[PDB]
Design a protein around this ligand. Sequence first.
Ligand code: IF2
Ligand code: MG
Ligand code: ZN
Length: 313
Amino acid sequence: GLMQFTLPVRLCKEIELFHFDIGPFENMWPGIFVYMVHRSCGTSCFELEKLCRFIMSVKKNYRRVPYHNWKHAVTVAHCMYAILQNNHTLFTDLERKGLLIACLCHDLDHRGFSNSYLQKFDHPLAALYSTSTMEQHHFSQTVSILQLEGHNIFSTLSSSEYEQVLEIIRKAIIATDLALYFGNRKQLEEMYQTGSLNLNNQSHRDRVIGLMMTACDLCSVTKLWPVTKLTANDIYAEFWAEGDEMKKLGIQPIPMMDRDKKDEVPQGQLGFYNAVAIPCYTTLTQILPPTEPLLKACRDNLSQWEKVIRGEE
Ligand SMILES: Cc1nc2ccccc2nc1CCc1nc(N2CCCC2)nn1C
Ligand SMILES: [Mg+2]
Ligand SMILES: [Zn+2]
């Protein structure tokens, strides 16, 4: 009750910044997450015993893949923490509770393969969930863990509040399907520009939270250049394994997943920053002005990938 989580001075200061790296010490990541819930939500949002037990079951259900692992989960939650803290008054008590949990859970039991590979492999999950295959699985795994004995961190919520928070978590996790991001951001762009965007419209909040989820999920592009560059190695280690698996099924993979096209990585990053990252943090800064450091940091890393192409590294 009177038990605050504190972090060492350097972490206590740097964790407030968008570009914070959670570091290589796995055993501190739960403490980091709790610290963020307490400062973002309150020391009263969750029974500590239940929260800790939930965090550790979530961790257990992330796999040892190069990118879509437990570190990704806590990184994506830290980004969401930075957004919520720099936009204090714009979000309900239920959204603050729900979104940090949604981010921790958003890639639960990921196998390091895209929805496309599941569908071409004919994985059982692809028959159970025809679109956003993995993302419906991730939400499904969230509900599973919430229903384990001693794991209901939402037990104090009313029947209807409980249903509202599970519906926030569901939409938030479905929105991490990048196939959905393009349309979602186009609509938000138009709505902001015609001045029709209304944060009292529940379907408008949904879209805005959806863009935040893309923002947090892509936040590897908003870090210091050495974090960004080294994370890219993990990302491509997954994609190239998937490319290998595509070739095993007798399918030429897309270039992004072909390890034979290593040399084109710098150009592929450019495309991605221009087609996805920049547009994402642009629209997000327009709708939420205090998230501008994500756009600024994204542009800095784009400039770093241009430097790689020019042979300056
Ligand atoms: C999908 C994706 N998500 C990321 C999320 C966060 C940080 C970096 C990310 N990088 C990518 C990969 C971008 C990409 N690479 C290539 N290649 C085509 C030939 C060689 C490389 N094409 N594209 C689109
Ligand atoms: Mg995902
Ligand atoms: Zn993710």
